[PDB]
Amino acid sequence: GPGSSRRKWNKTGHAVRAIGRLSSLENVYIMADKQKNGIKANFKIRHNVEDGSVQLADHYQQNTPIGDGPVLLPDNHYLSFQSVLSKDPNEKRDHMVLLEFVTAAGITLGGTGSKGEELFTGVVPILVELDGDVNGHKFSVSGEGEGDATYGKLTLKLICTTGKLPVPWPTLVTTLLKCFARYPDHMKQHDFFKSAMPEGYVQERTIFFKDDGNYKTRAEVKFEGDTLVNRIELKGIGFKEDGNILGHKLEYNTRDQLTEEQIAEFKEAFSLFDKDGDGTITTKELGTVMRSLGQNPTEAELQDMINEVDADGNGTIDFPEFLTMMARKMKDTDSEEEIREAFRVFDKDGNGYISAAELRHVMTNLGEKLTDEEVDEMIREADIDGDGQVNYEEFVQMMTAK
Ligand SMILES: [Ca+2]
Ligand SMILES: [Ca+2]
Ligand SMILES: [Ca+2]
Ligand SMILES: [Ca+2]
């Protein structure tokens, strides 16, 4: 057809790109399996390959309740995942520290929920145990951590007890606790996972690695004492002894990635908004901090603000949502300006220096509490050139664990 033969090349390779852009489903969709009194999920994971490529893992997931209870069968919706992989420098073994932030979304909105859901209310210790055989290569993984459903948080430390792990850690991530997802109140009756809980659910998967082998897994996620347990049997077949997986061509982490430390800071900051520590930030709660700083956003101005970062459009922001809005990277001239603007909030009289009382007003309006000696000591920490107060330079080189 008509158009520049340049126009046509590009238009063809915009729609091919487009297809791959639409095909990259980041979310994890949940459907019901009422006949199986359960749920399923079919999703893909893109594992970065060392040489720029990508190894994708086609996941096919089935879930069922172990017990005979009532269970909540959910409508179509999705989980939303943010994973952070790291190492403990103390730990000497082949291992992984894994942090997940899982939030539920997908639905536009007495009360109820599940009994089984009152068990996630606070922090739950986690035990994970995995038994696999990949292409004959046998290994065991073990680990502990905790789950904090309110901030959709999961933290684990996973050891390979049998010594060297014969597959890359990334590939085991999905396998080694969706009951730690934050289901927003407005859909807390689509949380199959907690509902099935105390007796628990089976989570079976087949993961197809493109041009490489497959993993089969069957796991029981149930309570033992008050430890939430994830116990797995993993069987892998079809894998070339030198594909990305068995040859370890897969990479651990990206590199622009949030440290465990940073995420902790973002949690503490989230708490500053979440006055009632109920895991969400409301228009009310946002207003309170805003006014406290000295602004007057209207009910509507707040609702907008939130609705612009509130994935599940329920009017509140939960920690993964917050964590997401903080995890966006910017054109570092926007980031720079963000810092310039943060500075001007701290530097209240706008004289270009943050004083001790200026630092105190900000932390105080933020709902922190502070001894004069802590204030004076913070200023000590930032006051490089030692003039008793903090300029823009000092603020920048003090603000950078972004
Ligand atoms: Ca709250
Ligand atoms: Ca929300
Ligand atoms: Ca000042
Ligand atoms: Ca200074």
Residue numbers in the entry: 1 to 109, 122 to 188, 192 to 417
In the authors' words:
Earlier we described circularly permuted GFP (cpGFP)-based Ca2+ sensors Case12 and Case16 with superior dynamic ranges of up to 12-fold and 16.5-fold increase in green fluorescence between Ca2+-free and Ca2+-saturated forms. The overall structure of these sensors is a monomer consisting of cpGFP “core” in its typical β-barrel shape inserted between an M13-peptide and CaM-domains. An alternative approach is to insert the single circularly permuted green fluorescent protein (cpGFP) between CaM and M13-peptide (fragment of myosin light-chain kinase). Thus Ca2+-dependent conformational changes can influence the chromophore environment and the fluorescent properties of the sensor directly.
Crystallization condition B (see Experimental Section) was used to generate a Ca2+-saturated crystal of another high-contrast Ca2+ sensor variant, Case12. The 3D-structure of Case12 at high Ca2+ concentration (Case12 structure B) was refined to a 2.6 Å resolution and revealed that the binding mode of the M13-peptide to the CaM-domain was similar to the recently reported Ca2+-saturated dimeric crystal structures of GCaMP2. Case12 structure B is a dimer in the asymmetric unit where the M13-peptide is bound to the CaM-moiety of the neighboring molecule. In contrast to the Case16 structure A, both lobes of CaM are bound to M13-peptide of a neighboring sensor molecule. As was expected for the Ca2+-saturated form of the sensor, all four Ca2+-binding pockets of CaM are occupied by Ca2+ ions. In contrast, at high concentration (16 mg/mL) in presence of 1 mM Ca2+ a second distinct molecular mass of about 90 kDa was observed indicating dimerization for both sensors. Therefore the detected fluorescent response of the sensor within the whole range of the monitored Ca2+ concentrations is induced by its monomeric form rather than its homodimer. The obtained Case12 structure B most probably resembles the non-functional homodimer and should not be interpreted as an example of the active Ca2+-saturated state of the sensor. Similar data were reported earlier for GCaMP2 Ca2+-saturated dimeric form. As shown in our light-scattering experiments, the formation of such a homodimer is favored at high sensor protein concentrations that could potentially be achieved locally in living cells with high sensor expression levels.
